[PDB]
Amino acid sequence: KALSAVILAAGKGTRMYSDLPKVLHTIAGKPMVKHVIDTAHQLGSENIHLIYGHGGDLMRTHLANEQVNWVLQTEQLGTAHAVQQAAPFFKDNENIVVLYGDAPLITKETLEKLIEAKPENGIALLTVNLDNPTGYGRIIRENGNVVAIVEQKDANAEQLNIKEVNTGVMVSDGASFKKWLARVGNNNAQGEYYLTDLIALANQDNCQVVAVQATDVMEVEGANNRLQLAALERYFQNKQASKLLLEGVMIYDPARFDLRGTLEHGKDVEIDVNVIIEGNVKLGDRVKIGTGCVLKNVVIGNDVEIKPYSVLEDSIVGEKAAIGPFSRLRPGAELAAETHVGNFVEIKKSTVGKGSKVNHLTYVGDSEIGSNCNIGAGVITCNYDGANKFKTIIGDDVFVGSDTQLVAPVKVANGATIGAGTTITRDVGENELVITRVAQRHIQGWQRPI
Amino acid sequence: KALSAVILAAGKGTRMYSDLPKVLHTIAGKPMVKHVIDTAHQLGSENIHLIYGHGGDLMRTHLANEQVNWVLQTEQLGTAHAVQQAAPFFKDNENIVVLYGDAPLITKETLEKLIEAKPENGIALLTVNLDNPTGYGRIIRENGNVVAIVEQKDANAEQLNIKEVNTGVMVSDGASFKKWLARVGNNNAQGEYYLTDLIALANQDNCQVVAVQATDVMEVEGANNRLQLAALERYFQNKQASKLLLEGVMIYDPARFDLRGTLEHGKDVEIDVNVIIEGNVKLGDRVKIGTGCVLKNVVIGNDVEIKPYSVLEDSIVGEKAAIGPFSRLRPGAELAAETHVGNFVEIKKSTVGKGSKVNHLTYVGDSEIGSNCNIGAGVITCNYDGANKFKTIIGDDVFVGSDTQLVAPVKVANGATIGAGTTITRDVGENELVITRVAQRHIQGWQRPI
Amino acid sequence: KALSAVILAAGKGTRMYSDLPKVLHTIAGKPMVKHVIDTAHQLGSENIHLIYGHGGDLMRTHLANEQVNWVLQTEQLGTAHAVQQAAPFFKDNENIVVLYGDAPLITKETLEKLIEAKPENGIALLTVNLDNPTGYGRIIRENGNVVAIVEQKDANAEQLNIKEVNTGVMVSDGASFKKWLARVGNNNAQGEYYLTDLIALANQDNCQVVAVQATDVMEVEGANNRLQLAALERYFQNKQASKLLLEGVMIYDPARFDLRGTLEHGKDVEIDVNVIIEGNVKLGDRVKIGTGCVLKNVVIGNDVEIKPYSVLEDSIVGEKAAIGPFSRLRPGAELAAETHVGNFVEIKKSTVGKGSKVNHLTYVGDSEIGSNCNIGAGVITCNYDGANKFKTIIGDDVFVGSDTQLVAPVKVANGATIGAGTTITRDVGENELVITRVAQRHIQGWQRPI
């Protein structure tokens, strides 16, 4: 049958000591709640009801494009109250899964098992075994079913030794949820309406609740502060690196690797220590990435080596190119096949054609550079002091001597040669040689201050 | 009552294989013994008696400014002999705490508990529970008190199973110390005067010794070699990162973060992987620090982003500034609000005014730069071949074209404009435009070597 | 007696998802099989028989210089079949040790113990204790000897609780190997000839097999995929760092240190976090290496500091030199004593004499620079657009002003002085001063676009 999710995300997250609400803090570059939304979506959820409250405006700006129903909870009166806000929208004969915006590691696989174990008119409850279950509600199994969740303070001596514990995530049909939610009270020490009580209420109705154990404890772990969040971060990154290693990516140290988005890869890819991969990154076969590199939203072709401490963003690099070390590719950098970019070089919004080299101490911006060019050390494309930023066009087989200033807008045609120390403001024609006539003063017998 | 400390710090530290004495090796940028001195001071110690010996001159030069009594021990005849060197200076009615210069992680909190548990005319002894207590003296409790410390070789079968062990740190009043120290002998396999024997001597006098367990084993851990020291280092750094995360600093990976000094922070600060913080550093609200950055003795204002692989020392950065990546701020760099410093830029002992930008391949040194200036790529402030290093003064709203050499001493007044490839040796007046007249030779039909 | 080894290295390594065969994947920069070959050699092996098959051509190109007998196995019919390929070459009265090319961490020390425990006409079998020995063959000891290796599916209830397990590495004399190998069959579920069966066959012959336990479990660990290989990598690096720390090298974080070759060191060497050491590296006394540095095939003299994010390859640095941060030394960089190389500087195949400084934004290539020179910011050695790359020679006590282009081939004699913004194409004589005569246009009353 159909499925919809409810995600609880209204918390202030006081112990984060932040102006952001609790669930907006990121894991692997994405808000915690966004992980849960994505998981709900790939689970097959028709509707996703987002219970929000604190930091309302920030939730809306940061998650403006998410396909969710925005259910604003004016008061935090408990998890049952929270879910009941969305209940008017539950279809009677759809399954409903309840998830927490601050527990982002929960997997689609675990949740499929939960949904599959839900008996008709009943509940599937996700549990977890802890080594020290102190403070948490114990699962009481009478036969194969859950008959009670006994809280720490109520449990007897032998019930305290039970390791199986309630996570609060559960699945039931929409009609059941509407019926049971209306029956939960707040007669307890905290004065709150607990979703937990649905288990007692189901048992009162002679309905079954089946437990499904989570495989990984970390899956159901929430974050109430930044220390806990950093532990979730490390577990997530290590799991991402492990999956890539098992797919054939050589990661020299998985504890020193960060993926903050998606990585598509060929075979025999090598990624050295302390690399960060952000946004959508695609690497072809036998790409090698040296230590300290940062790649954000790039496509890298087969057989390219990126040497240490290169930073690349929104760029494309063709096959057999060599980049780094200490290279910077800014947005719109498009490097063709067999190009060379070297140390202390910055390339911004420019195309560089096949075989061309830019190997030292150079800024190229808003330029088209053709094939088999040689851009010398210390070359700079610049503009006049004016308004907008104009383009430099360099054809094929051009030599640009070191320390040349190319003053946009300007064109240098095929086969041109420019001498070192030149200032180019006028168009250079095909096979034109431009050299600077320097005037120098030579003084003989000049003794330096020892 | 009053308190003074004794710190044992005379050891050669042979297994460090160093020209330094044992306690001078650093943890988090500070000598091990300096940690212990600081802890003693914040505990409220009136006097700190530093027992030193090996590497005497180095101890004095490296710790010249420490408020301690320098007690030179000519021979290392045991811990009791060491403490007795300082005993002539103990006030009869002050408490005395004994600490070890090579066990730097001991906390003020643990030591306050120790002092508080000391019975009158007695001793409080700090103990620790080990899982494998082999080699260490076992604590024998008769009722609530310690009646013996039984060494490995003397213990019977059941005493070997005792996990509680002697750390050697203790507190007693000064008169007791003077009396008992004079009674310790050296009749043992090692021929040494052990401070350990004070426990037996106290029990002989019908005086109480109360045990206080250390909460963390690592607290009382010493370092006899650099492997052990590296473990202390990692435990200290992880504990520092944990405290910051709990205060609301987002540290992406606490295992890849190093603090070597003090950090003051606002809210919503983000610190990426592999950052090093040294000396005294202050970060305002929502400062973001990219991967690989090194910050030593800097003040960073609200809302600044420091992009990857930036190194900053002895510098100030105003609010909403953007630094990096690959930027270098050397001592005396003062950047106003809303400034921009970019890749492969070095700024040394210079002020840069509000809104000004220095975005590529530039050295600025000994300069004052005003507000809303545009310093082009490849700009260099330099000096004549002479003696001292003179100043470059640039006013407000100045444009300095790329690859311009500013030759100090020189002034460029408000609103001036300098063209690319210029050499500035003479003062530039207000609203003055300076452009270089290049002479170029153009040769048509120059065929390049294919 | 004499010894020879057999190394099994024919596997395809399917779960690596690589075009390389299994044993060519690297640990610490060296193929797994190369580790095992080296260990065999230092064990004293006269012959090393390398059983190879898959990726045959790649094995030959990558290991062309290894002193091994190349034994090509056309079909993988089991470990006994593999070893029997080399058996015609076993000397009757030499010991033979069998090792696996995909288990590279096995030590010479463990293997010496194995060889020493081998009884005459018998076998020494290397075993290991696992906490979960499921799937592995259990060692059955009758008295002091091994009488059977019982596989998972054959073991009874109490045999399943045995933790001691078969590793497959063993030692026997050559005649025994020839005799027993010819008797192993393939009547089992997998239809393979197992080397394991030698233990049964020895017991049939009334020959002794003695077990030798491995001290470290990781020693005998193989890698079937890149996740397992990364774990071997981390264990190896941590063990290398631990050995160096125990020798007196201060490594701030051994979990953030990589050695990929050999390191020779003096005393009081300090290596900060995230350093990579490759090839053969030699560091003198009190060398300090800042964070992020990469050193490949370099010799560093006493008392040099290398500041953060410096990359050095195939270079020599004399004593008291200061390098970095952000410095690049390319192959053939030879820096004398007391030199200074600064940020965003690249030095390639050049000698730089004592006291000379190159501190910013500079490329020096194919040059000889004398002693006490001052190479200014923005200096570049370049060539004409021609064929090969010519040399720049700079004598002693030369001042080269900032942004000077040195156009090879060219010589600058002792004591010369070159002004900023100069283009040098002609030889400069001793004590010659060369300054550029600029022509500038000054326009007063030029108002900038606000």
Ligand SMILES: O=c1ccn([C@@H]2O[C@H](COP(=O)(O)OP(=O)(O)O)[C@@H](O)[C@H]2O)c(=O)[nH]1
């Ligand atoms: O009325 C509520 C109660 C809770 N929550 C959120 O649901 C999650 C778990 O609720 P619980 O009371 O079981 O744990 P706590 O919030 O006390 O840590 C937290 O992120 C809460 O902020 C909510 O959105 N509305």
Ligand SMILES: O=c1ccn([C@@H]2O[C@H](COP(=O)(O)OP(=O)(O)O)[C@@H](O)[C@H]2O)c(=O)[nH]1
């Ligand atoms: O006469 C002494 C004996 C010891 N110590 C120092 O006190 C610490 C602990 O002394 P112990 O004999 O219990 O351990 P060991 O020095 O044998 O490791 C070490 O740093 C010693 O160098 C000292 O300064 N003077």
Ligand SMILES: O=c1ccn([C@@H]2O[C@H](COP(=O)(O)OP(=O)(O)O)[C@@H](O)[C@H]2O)c(=O)[nH]1
């Ligand atoms: O006929 C063979 C059988 C195995 N091996 C290699 O020897 C090692 C261990 O052999 P085993 O069958 O015990 O483990 P598996 O290869 O099944 O992981 C592996 O690297 C194999 O590729 C080999 O070279 N020839």
